[PDB]
């Protein structure tokens, strides 16, 4: 009704002159936001010996009070590639480790996983045994030493290996014919694969896993959960900040 | 003049499959011409242009006798981890990879004598509660009628039907990307012969080939034997 300004008639609104651009919406770009390293997960090393289990790279159903957790939960289907940074931080005395090789093995979505120490290295009496699936071969094996290491880390890029054209972040159905409470929001292979960290350190320290998601694509936006509580009616939340009145 | 360089943290690490070569220390070697026939460049081609025999109870074939009917003569679940696909080239090649896509071609060869005849009904049954027990049940599915004595050999294609673009090579407790159903063969009629005392049974050899749309991806390392 009437539309634009200053007569005050019913339905009439005053003039507004829209602002000019400046930032160009570059920062709200989906793939820009996800192409950075995020500290998601922290994990323990397995001993060289025994029958270790692989850790699945699935950052999807998180509750973590971190920016990547909510963000990954903003869409229904997701596709992206992956980059990893694995670091190693001592939890004991750094002089406990004189060599400290760490074998990292990455497995594509669908890879077989049973391993037991099976590859023997021999030298002057004593010997060392590594896992059947830690050896360098078909899938990537990375070996880094923690001892004098200036960064006690490694890192590499890996692609989207799932069989699904897109990863369902939410799934209204079951991933298996038997409909068990377990296979509910499920679907097999909705992830990035799995890794196996193995080392004579294992005690002595842990890791720090960071994910970077290059080439991200999101489908079907979903509601974004709050993050903070609701302040009192008619008030404003007040947070500590850079700006703030001294 | 010295170039400012920043050493990445993953610096002195190994990374086994880097897309790059090491430094050469023994240059200029010209290698002799290697004529030699039968070079192959892709394993999928030899899997498609070649057939292997299945392992039905340890033999490469199933039998029809003069007493048969109803029950399935051959049954295998559609998964490369199936038992009857055990000694085959396609199954064995597959263990090097995590995922597969496409169809499998099965061809049955009736080796019963020329004085012998029988008819088979071969069906592809999709994932279901539990697999049909008689042919009148399975015949509701995709099936073909093989009358030996028309052609002694018969090819049947097990299709790829799934919501996923690839399925798993390494199966396990039934999942939506583990199994694709069952392949069954029934006797439409029992073996007939010119003299039942001379020929009482006939054997159908069953061979598998990779279908035209078959493919394998994701090379994987061998896990503990089982």
């Amino acid at each position: 009704v009437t539309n634009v300004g200053e007569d005050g008639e019913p339905g009439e609104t005053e003039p507004r002159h829209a602002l000019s651009p400046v930032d160009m919406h570059v920062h709200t770009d989906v793939s820009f936001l996800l192409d950075r390293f995020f500290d998601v997960e922290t994990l323990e090393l397995s001993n060289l010996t025994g029958s270790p289990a692989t850790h699945v790279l699935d950052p999807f159903g998180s509750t973590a009070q971190l920016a990547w957790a909510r963000l990954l939960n903003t869409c229904t289907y997701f596709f992206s590639d992956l980059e990893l940074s694995i670091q190693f931080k001592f939890t004991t005395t750094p002089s406990s480790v004189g060599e400290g090789f760490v074998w990292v093995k990455w497995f594509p979505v669908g890879a077989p996983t049973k391993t037991t120490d099976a590859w023997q290295l021999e030298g002057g009496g004593n010997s060392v045994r590594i896992q059947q699936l830690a050896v360098a071969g078909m899938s990537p094996t990375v070996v880094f030493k923690i001892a004098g290491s200036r960064s006690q880390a490694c890192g590499f890029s890996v692609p989207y290996t799932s069989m699904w054209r897109v990863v369902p972040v939410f799934y209204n159905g079951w991933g298996a014919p038997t409909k068990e409470k377990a296979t509910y929001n499920w679907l097999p292979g909705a992830h990035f694969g799995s890794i196996l960290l193995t080392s004579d350190a294992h005690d002595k320290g842990g890791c720090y896993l960071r994910y970077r998601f290059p080439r991200a694509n999101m489908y079907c936006p979903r509601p974004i959960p709050p993050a903070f509580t609701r302040p009192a009616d008619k008030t404003r939340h007040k947070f500590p900040t850079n700006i703030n009145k001294q | 003049a010295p170039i400012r360089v920043v050493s990445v943290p993953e610096s002195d690490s190994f990374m086994s499959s880097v897309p790059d070569n090491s430094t050469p220390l023994y240059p200029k070697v010209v290698v002799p011409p290697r004529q030699v026939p039968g070079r192959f460049t892709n394993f999928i081609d030899v899997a498609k242009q070649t057939y292997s025999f299945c392992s039905i109870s340890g033999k490469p074939y199933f039998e029809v006798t003069n007493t048969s009917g109803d029950e399935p003569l051959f049954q295998m679940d559609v998964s490369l981890s199936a038992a009857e696909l055990h000694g085959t080239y396609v199954a064995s090649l597959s263990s090097f990879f995590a995922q597969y896509r496409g169809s499998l071609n099965f061809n049955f060869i009736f080796t019963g004598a020329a004085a012998t005849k029988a008819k088979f009904l071969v069906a592809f049954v999709p994932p279901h509660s539990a697999a049909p027990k008689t042919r009148d049940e399975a015949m509701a599915c995709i099936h073909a009628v093989w009358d030996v004595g028309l052609n002694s050999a018969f090819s049947f294609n097990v299709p790829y039907s799934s919501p996923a673009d690839f399925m798993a090579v390494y199966s396990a407790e039934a999942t939506v990307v583990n199994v694709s159903g069952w392949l069954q063969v029934y006797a439409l009629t029992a073996l007939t012969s010119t003299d039942i005392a001379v020929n009482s049974k006939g054997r159908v050899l069953v061979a598998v080939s990779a279908g035209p749309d078959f493919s394998l991806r994701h090379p994987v390392d061998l896990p503990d034997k089982q």
């Binding site: 651009p21 400046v22 | 170039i3 400012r4």
Partner: peptide, 21 residues
């Protein structure tokens, strides 16, 4: 002022600095 390497643009002009509107 004070950037004289041929490699000063190893990173694009939009990544290395800010951009005026």
């Amino acid at each position: 002022g004070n950037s004289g390497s041929i490699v000063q643009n190893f990173y694009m002009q939009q990544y290395q600095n800010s951009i005026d509107a």
